[PDB]
Symmetry: D3
Subunit: 216 residues, 6 copies
């Protein structure tokens, strides 16, 4: 079974050894349970700092996105280096390169690809290219809520929903490209807290707090 894990950039902002460790464990563990794993890393606050500074000097939007992409790639190298023998030792820069890299039978870690999208879209593209039926989005909230839970207090986690529900809820988590891709290739998305990465197998069994998004 092939699975893709998107790791929120916020995971890297914590500057917390435990995050990396728990991720390392989780990949080792998925492997032992017969999964091939691809990982996509977000840009986080590093991306936002570089983007903000570049924007203030008039750097255009393409190049701003590219700085965000390089920040995401820095996080990809960190993860890749933490996996040593498990991972193919190259961070692909495009979907085309990911396909080549995935051919080596090992874990592949990637950052961004192209301006105008997020790393959630990259995770979807990479899930599609690897025939992964499940994309896990490991982020800093427990699942999908009615509204953004870091604005709105007492908002309820939605354990099971569709991509058409999600679109309405979102009007970052998943961008338009990500949703288009998971819909056309019928990829199931699980949104979970990265804190619960130590419990990843239980989440895939549906035993633990998460949101499951069905493609329609």
């Amino acid at each position: 079974m092939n699975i893709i894990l998107k790791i929120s950039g916020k995971f890297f902002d914590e500057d917390n050894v435990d995050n990396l460790i728990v991720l390392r464990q989780s990949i080792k563990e998925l492997a032992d349970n017969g999964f091939r794993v691809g990982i996509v890393t977000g840009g986080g606050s590093t991306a936002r700092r570089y983007i903000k500074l570049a924007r203030e000097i008039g750097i255009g939007e393409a190049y701003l996105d590219l700085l965000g992409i390089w920040a995401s790639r820095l996080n990809a190298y960190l993860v890749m280096f933490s996996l040593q023998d498990l991972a193919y030792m190259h961070v692909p820069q495009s979907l085309e390169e990911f396909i080549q890299d995935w051919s080596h039978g090992k874990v592949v870690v990637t950052g961004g690809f192209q301006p105008g999208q997020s790393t959630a879209a990259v995770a979807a593209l990479v899930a599609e290219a690897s025939s992964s039926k499940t994309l896990v989005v490991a982020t800093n909230v427990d699942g999908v809520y009615e509204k953004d839970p870091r604005i709105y207090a007492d908002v309820k986690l939605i354990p099971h929903l569709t991509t058409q529900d999600l679109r309405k809820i979102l009007e970052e988590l998943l961008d338009p490209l990500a949703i288009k891709i998971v819909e056309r290739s019928k990829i199931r998305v699980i949104v979970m807290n990265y804190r619960k990465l130590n419990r990843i197998i239980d989440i895939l069994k549906g035993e633990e707090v998460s949101s499951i998004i069905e493609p329609v």
Copy 2:
């Protein structure tokens, strides 16, 4: 300053020497008028044919898009080879590669980059990266109409509109499938809006009048970013 020309795949389906001859001429005329030019080529019926066959054997959507991309790149090599000394002799395979290639001060010709988008999105990205204020979409209709002019008769060509208008004209008509025919896709519109790029939709049959079109003195549609 800089301009991007998207050339519809349908231009290549015609298999006509005059098409290439006239594109070639227009580029020279743009250069001689002080423009740097980037060119994006569509995949056309070659793309569709490969996509259809691959889809019949169960090949997934990512790989279908890639076949479409490789068909577009074949057209890009044709165009690039027709330009000889004017062009940097490399077809970039990503936006990042385009930026590097654009650095050589010559014409750059590209095809597709990534699954889930069209060559119009590529042309928008490449316009954004080259600080082109104008993207020209040279296609097999004279401009933008209220509805598809190859489906609906005596709809009127819309000479000047906004991206908001275009979004409504094109809304609800587009499939997520590899090989879908589009004018401008969602990524293309997002990009031209965020970077304030004006889009001119014209017939490639009038590439011989490319300067007059830029001056607003020939049949075309001008789309203003909002």
Copy 3:
């Protein structure tokens, strides 16, 4: 052991799903019988079409050949994508790249390399580099005929011959570089109909209609 299969461009001109299905099937068959397979695809009518148009506008012969090479590569991607996990996911652009790609232990699919030759020469080069003792040319024709079966009716098939017989017959199929390479490295060439890709194992035993060309 290692075998190279050249697939005529005419195979791709048929725009027939059943062809790909049998190629796919014939390669899994070879793998299951202990063969490592490399595949070279021809440019076919797409190549001739681009070449003709480019030639009309005065494009030089190097660039015409390159357009034919890119058309061949488009067919290589199609075949590579049809093989999914069996193939290393990269189409090598040179013999040097083929050697690197072959190092991954998987099926490698290539198109052309260099102006002034055909994809048959590429297949020979790739046979030589992979220590393949046999090169199979799967074409639109049953074998080597006394002359061109496209043009002449009732001409007969030569089940067996040498590389100088072939040169004399030819002065398509195999070009000068292809013959020089198979002669210097003593590679046997089997010419067969791509329809018969199903009996590829029977053809290799010598138990189906084909022409075997011995290197001298």
Copy 4:
């Protein structure tokens, strides 16, 4: 002439629009005065943060250096993007790539190359490969002091010294590779405060506060 500017990673830690801006004008100015410019960017606090976290999870020293190198490249992209038409739009990853990139006649911006050295060593190697006779180290101090001015109060700036003096002062500013290279190729090094980049032409004339290091 050709000149190389090393920009301390501390320049990027300031998260200050002013810094990038003043650097932008300095290259434009150097260009207008007939200089070809190469730029090498340090990794700064981003590099330190990634290295510290990776070290805590047992990542080996090669990979720690590589994280520092990727952080320095992120800063190189920022600078390169700020220069737009003036710069060749590729960040070289080795000295060999730098030499190819430098061939385009434009500004080249680089980060790190190889574990076991600093970006000062990169700036030296790049100065040597570009036949630059002057390397400017633009850092967060006015020049070379008797001892580290960020530690030792009341220490005096040394306006003119040799590479053997510097070696004794240091026993990072310049590492062993950097010193070896500037000695063997007789490259003069100017240490200056990056805050005075606005005044860069006056520094090259010797008419502003700086330290000039002569190769011996």
Copy 5:
């Protein structure tokens, strides 16, 4: 006007900087006279030393050619490094890469490309791709002779001949691919002594001992 210059590997066997100095001189002579120059270097005795040793341990013919190609590339780097600012600083490894490298408007130096041919064939391909109407073969003999002048003593130089004559004379210098290419693209070939490289302009004007081969 574009011209290609093939420099015999024997030029590099001589182990003398006077040869490089004259070649270097020759290229400035050509540039200053309005020529764009491409250079192809032979492998010489280094290639022969590696091929012989590899052949003794049973290394196959593809790989023997590749060792010869790498030897030719070492000579290409030497020449390219001797040209400094005049040359684009990349040695292309294929015809496709040459075309990209030629796009920079500078001198391009190459070695070999592909097994089964010589550097003369490379020079022809590169002449064809650069629209060069003249290929100069600078070798250790004054021109073309009625037979190999190092094997049969006292034979006459042929100052003016055709490619059909040459193919009869040769039944080294130019291989079958080289001849096919210069014929199809109508490229004139001048065979000269590399000792007379100082007098390339006079040779191009037909005022110095050489053989001119006309394509038929």
Copy 6:
């Protein structure tokens, strides 16, 4: 376990078949004993020859090193081609590329990377990146001596020493090589390449060699 074997350029200057056949058999000996092997080849006399000529025409030091690097790469291709199926068929040009190449589970053969260092420094970098605990330097001398045995008569072989001893002796291994083996605690064995036939015995400490302990 992972091991790196640095082969002196002098090995390639000798021009005899046995050398290659006997390197070839060692790695197959090492592989069969459970080792993953990386190999770094020196530039030898080919390097010095190109360097000397280029230096005479005024070519700068960066480009002289690069010519030496290309000569080392030519030796790497020779070795790689002699190993056939055992090796990943790419010579990496940087430490970054080596790491990617090493990911294929096969033998990787490298030459130089970067001006200002030697192929011994490459071997140390590559040992560090592959988590090799042992770097073998197979050279034209039996081990480490109190001083250069070519330049000095009657000197003795030191069977066991530290990296701090070695840098006093050298005032084989360059400064980057020593820094890297010290920071990553890599043991270096210096041996004669003529004894590549008894490489397993050398690793067990059962033949003539010098072992250098990192301090």
